[PDB]
């Protein structure tokens, strides 16, 4: 299938409680493989998946150095951001970063990403062209001007088209037994009377990977989008994910309802109904 590598970085200031904490977590698809936390007693790039453990000492200490420097960079960014928005030194603020690359089944670059949010709001993003920026406001325009002057986009493009794609391909090869294995959902439909007049049908999907899934209910073949309660896809803790969708149905009308499941691990999509 297609695959992604993404780093998710969070830097958060905490006036009166030391310097801003920096945490970076790296993923291939829905599998975390590294973490770095400046609050760790001994901050270092640490493995969080078995297939990365085979990388030698040079991998770990080179990445550790990048992340230690990134901690300082993000602190610089937070200081600058506070100024751009004329903010007090009393408050806590958050800078988030997402960067990395997507590749197709053949390992070719689909696109790169490098974007930032300040206090939960999009701030600046590298455009899909990997050459230009989109700034959200006049503060981000200051960053944009600075990054244009320093030709930052050219450095990011080189990273995203080269290093990122090269390492993603390497990770996919080393972890092929897991990263390139889609585990289909185990499914069932439960039935819960709520009154004499109505009952809940709940369609379950358990044990699937990756997280992307489509779970829908139909009544007489029509999608019940508005009337379906759909919980957020949630991690089980064993790499897999879970999800359910529920509809309230009139008593006696259960067989008019079908649950439909689409997932990469399924040979064919599923159509389930309540099986009393």
């Amino acid at each position: 299938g297609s695959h992604s590598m993404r780093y998710f970085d969070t830097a958060m200031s905490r006036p009166g409680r030391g310097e801003p904490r920096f945490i970076s977590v790296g993923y291939v698809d829905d599998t975390q493989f590294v973490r770095f936390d400046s609050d760790a007693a001994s901050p270092r790039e640490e493995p969080r998946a078995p297939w990365i453990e085979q990388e030698g000492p040079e991998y770990w200490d080179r990445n550790t150095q990048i992340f230690k420097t990134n901690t300082q960079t993000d602190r610089c960014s937070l200081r600058n951001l506070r100024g751009y928005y004329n903010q007090s030194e009393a408050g806590s603020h958050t800078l988030q970063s997402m960067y990395g690359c997507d590749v197709g089944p053949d390992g070719r670059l689909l696109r790169g990403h490098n974007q930032y949010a300040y206090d939960g709001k999009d701030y600046i993003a590298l455009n899909e062209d990997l050459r230009s920026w989109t700034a959200a406001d006049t503060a981000a325009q200051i960053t944009q001007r600075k990054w244009e002057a320093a030709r930052v986009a050219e450095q990011d493009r080189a990273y995203l088209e080269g290093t990122c794609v090269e390492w993603l391909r390497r990770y996919l090869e080393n972890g092929k037994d897991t990263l390139e294995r889609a585990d289909p959902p185990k499914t069932h439909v439960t039935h819960h009377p709520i009154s004499d007049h109505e009952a809940t049908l709940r369609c379950w999907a358990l044990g699937f990977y990756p997280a992307e899934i489509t779970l829908t209910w139909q009544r007489d073949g029509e999608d019940q989008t508005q009337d379906t309660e759909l919980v957020e896809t949630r991690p089980a803790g064993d790499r897999t994910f879970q999800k359910w969708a529920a509809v309230v149905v009139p008593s006696g009308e259960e067989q008019r309802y079908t649950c439909h499941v689409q997932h990469e691990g399924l040979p064919k999509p599923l159509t389930l109904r309540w099986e009393p």
Binding site: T10, M12, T94, G120, E232, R234, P235
Partner: protein, 99 residues
């Protein structure tokens, strides 16, 4: 400027009374990232609950999974207690094996 957490409490494996399992509390969709999560057994805080590394979704909202070993029974009640800046008081969500 703030987003309140969604909370789900559930088990790793299908629940079977008397068989060891894992109790999860997944908090998601929140901003900012500071959050306190306790897992409760009959109203009491479970010790040494672990959690995932802080990460976020593409809409920038944070998520964490808190988890601990547990053995479901008919009589024992489990819950997750969450506090966040967006909440006046801690929110308690009870474990229901059907959700």
């Amino acid at each position: 400027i703030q987003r309140t957490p969604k909370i789900q409490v559930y088990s790793r494996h299908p629940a079977e009374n008397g068989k060891s399992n894992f109790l999860n509390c997944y908090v998601s969709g929140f901003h900012p990232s500071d959050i306190e999560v306790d897992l409760l057994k009959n109203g009491e805080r479970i010790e040494k609950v672990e959690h995932s590394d802080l990460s976020f979704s593409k809409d920038w909202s944070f998520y964490l999974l808190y988890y601990t070993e547990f053995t479901p029974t008919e009589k024992d009640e489990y819950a997750c207690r969450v506090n966040h800046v967006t909440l006046s008081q801690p929110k308690i969500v009870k474990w229901d094996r059907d959700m």
